[PDB]
Amino acid sequence: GSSGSSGTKQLAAAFHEEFVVREDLMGLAIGTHGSNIQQARKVPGVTAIELDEDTGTFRIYGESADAVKKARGFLEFVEDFIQVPSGPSSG
């Protein structure tokens, strides 16, 4: 995800993604201290990224579907995963 943006050709976004995520999966979908989201916004072609809590619908804005799509994967819901550190290092 090398950096090197310039700007937006059109004010609005030609492509827009709008989907509803389970309020139960949202948490994980977003990650810690807004990790996922932050990342999704770090994706090129993405003009902006809004989220609706009232219903829980993630609204992505990108000049090209390819962008909003790549970022969407980050906002997409994720099944409950359990990854153990297999060795809690104290220090």
From Swiss-Prot:
It comes from the Eukaryota. Expressed in all tissues examined including heart, brain, kidney and testis. In brain, present at high level in neurons and especially in the Purkinje cells at the interface between the granular layer and the molecular layer (at protein level). Phosphorylated by MAPK1/ERK2, promoting subsequent phosphorylation by GSK3B. Phosphorylated by GSK3B, promoting ubiquitination and degradation by the proteasome. Ubiquitinated by the SCF(FBXO4) complex, leading to its degradation by the proteasome: ubiquitination by the SCF(FBXO4) complex takes place following phosphorylation by GSK3B. Ubiquitinated and degraded in a GSK3B-dependent manner in during both scaling and sleep deprivation. Ubiquitinated via 'Lys-63'-linked ubiquitin, leading to its degradation: interaction with CEP63 inhibits 'Lys-63'-linked ubiquitination. Induction: By Interleukin-19 (IL19). It is found in: Cytoplasm, Cytoplasmic ribonucleoprotein granule; Cytoplasm, Stress granule; Cytoplasm; Cell projection, Dendrite. Changing A29T: In a breast cancer sample; somatic mutation. Residues 18-47 form the KH domain. mRNA-binding protein that acts as a regulator of mRNAs translation and/or stability, and which is required for various processes, such as neurogenesis, muscle development and spermatogenesis. Specifically binds to AU-rich elements (AREs) in the 3'-UTR of target mRNAs. Promotes formation of some phase-separated membraneless compartment by undergoing liquid-liquid phase separation upon binding to AREs-containing mRNAs, leading to assemble mRNAs into cytoplasmic ribonucleoprotein granules that concentrate mRNAs with associated regulatory factors. It is linked to Congenital myopathy 9A: An autosomal recessive muscular disorder characterized by severe hypotonia apparent at birth, poor feeding, ulnar deviation of the hands, laterally deviated feet, fractures of the long bones, respiratory insufficiency due to muscle weakness, and death in infancy. Homodimer (via CC domains); homodiremization is required for FXR1-network nucleation. Interacts with FMR1. Interacts with FRX2. Interacts with TDRD3. Interacts with HABP4. Interacts with CYFIP2 but not with CYFIP1. Interacts with EIF4G3; promoting translation of target mRNAs. Interacts with ELAVL1. Interacts with CEP63; inhibiting 'Lys-63'-linked ubiquitination. Interacts with PKP3; the interaction facilitates the binding of PKP3 to PKP2 mRNA. Interacts with PKP1; the interaction may facilitate the binding of PKP1 to PKP2, PKP3 and DSP mRNA. Belongs to the FMR1 family. The tandem Agenet-like domains preferentially recognize trimethylated histone peptides. This is RNA-binding protein FXR1. It comes from Homo sapiens (Human). The chain holds residues 212 to 289 of 621 of the full protein.
